Amino acid sequence: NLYFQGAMSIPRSQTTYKKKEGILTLTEDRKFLIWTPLPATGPPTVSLALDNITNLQQTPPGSAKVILKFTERPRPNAEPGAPPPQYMFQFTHPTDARAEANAIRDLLSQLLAAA
Numbered sequence: 001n002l003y004f005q006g007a008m009s010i011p012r013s014q015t016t017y018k019k020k021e022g023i024l025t026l027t028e029d030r031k032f033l034i035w036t037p038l039p040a041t042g043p044p045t046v047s048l049a050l051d052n053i054t055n056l057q058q059t060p061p062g063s064a065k066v067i068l069k070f071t072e073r074p075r076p077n078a079e080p081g082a083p084p085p086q087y088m089f090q091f092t093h094p095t096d097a098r099a100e101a102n103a104i105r106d107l108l109s110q111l112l113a114a115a
């Protein structure tokens with residue numbers, strides 16, 4: 001019977017990464033999570049293929065900061081004791097930070113399950 005894909009639009013959210021302000025979004029094919037520093041006219045500094053993402057975590061509501069943390073699959077010759085690569089994005093929209101985190105989280109979780 002029927003097959004449905006997510007139809008919510010791709011958001012562009014104000015976020016800090018490694019203490020630099022930028023924009024977190026997805027590529028138009030919804031296959032990469034990309035973060036670009038402001039002004040966001042250059043190339044992404046982070047490009048994470050959703051196929052390589054193994055975990056999605058968040059600060060709980062009421063935390064000092066609204067953060068999503070994405071974990072990637074270990075690099076090929078990483079040592080077996082080493083932590084996996086991780087990426088923390090702090091949402092900085094003065095009123096909508098948590099809403100915006102929620103929207104990205106929901107869209108990513110849907111895409112990750114659909115693959």
Ligand SMILES: [Cl-]
Binds near residue numbers: 063
């Ligand atoms: Cl919150």
Ligand SMILES: [Cl-]
Binds near residue numbers: 106
């Ligand atoms: Cl949910």
Ligand SMILES: [Cs+]
Binds near residue numbers: 011012013014100
């Ligand atoms: Cs936005």
Ligand SMILES: [Cs+]
Binds near residue numbers: 050052053054112115
């Ligand atoms: Cs995945």
Ligand SMILES: [Cs+]
Binds near residue numbers: 054055
């Ligand atoms: Cs997983």
Ligand SMILES: [Cs+]
Binds near residue numbers: 064
């Ligand atoms: Cs907060």
Ligand SMILES: [Cs+]
Binds near residue numbers: 074075076077078080
């Ligand atoms: Cs490894």
Ligand SMILES: [Cs+]
Binds near residue numbers: 085086087088
């Ligand atoms: Cs990192």
Ligand SMILES: [Cs+]
Binds near residue numbers: 014092093094
């Ligand atoms: Cs901001």
Ligand SMILES: [Cs+]
Binds near residue numbers: 113115
């Ligand atoms: Cs699937």
